[PDB]
């Protein structure tokens, strides 16, 4: 990709400790219900704050997002929708300042499959916080390892690896997606790398 930095540690799945972003992960997991509740509050389509997720192609099913940060820019109207979550995230420039990432609620509905794909850059890691996870039917593969989400828990993967998602439940799957700068990027790089 045009948006890669050579030599950045490359592995499909990361532990929180490996990323060094332990305070961010702890805060996400401490406050998971608070974050979930704000997502649920605006989740009404009648409200209509969740919009289609066109980030990548899906074979079938429905997929929606409510984006709080985009390329390091706070969505003001969105944060009025999720004020406590936004206030919380502001403590963590490693994600709010990630100009190559996003911060968003992501809902995936029953009968959805997202084709194998890669993100645009090896310069971010993608955190998933489980908010509402169906008992069965949802999973995500990254490279050769397939995993499931857990409510209140963070998964972290390098989405520049090929990954793929299935929603084979009967009820919706809500997660919170938090992108961070790859931890081996210098402060100079975090300041100067053009957004994507
Ligand atoms: Ni993806």
Numbering used by the authors: 563 to 758
Question: What does the publication say?
Answer:
Here, we report crystallographic and biochemical results on the structure and substrate selectivity of AspH. The results reveal a key role for the TPR domain of AspH in substrate binding and, unexpectedly, that the preferred EGFD-substrates of AspH have a non-canonical (Cys3–4) disulfide pattern. Whilst the oxygenase domain fold of AspH is typical for the 2OG oxygenase superfamily, details of its active site and the role of the TPR domain in EGFD-substrate binding are remarkable. Whatever the precise extent of conformational changes during catalysis, the results reveal a central role for the TPR domain in enabling AspH catalysis—without it, 2OG turnover occurs, but EGFDs are not hydroxylated.
However, no hydroxylation of hFX EGF139mer was detected by mass spectrometry (MS). Using a [1-14C]-2OG based assay, we observed AspH-Ox catalysed turnover of 2OG to CO2 in the absence of substrate, demonstrating oxygenase activity, albeit uncoupled from substrate hydroxylation as precedented with some other 2OG oxygenases under certain conditions. A structure of the AspH oxygenase domain (AspH-Ox) was determined with Ni(II), substituting for Fe(II), and with L-malate (from the crystallisation buffer) bound in the predicted 2OG binding pocket. As expected, the AspH-Ox structure is comprised of 8 β-strands forming a double-stranded beta-helix (DSBH) fold, with its active site located at the more open end of the β-sandwich. In contrast to most 2OG oxygenases, the active site metal is only coordinated by two histidine residues (His679, His725), located on DSBH strands II and VII. Two water molecules and a malate molecule complete octahedral coordination of the metal ion. Overall, the Asp-Ox structure validates the expected DSBH fold with intact Fe(II) and 2OG-binding sites, consistent with the observed 2OG turnover. In the AspH-Ox structure, the side chain of Glu617 appears to mimic the Asp103hFX side chain interactions with Lys666 and Arg688, possibly reflecting a function for this residue in protecting the active site from oxidation in the absence of substrate.
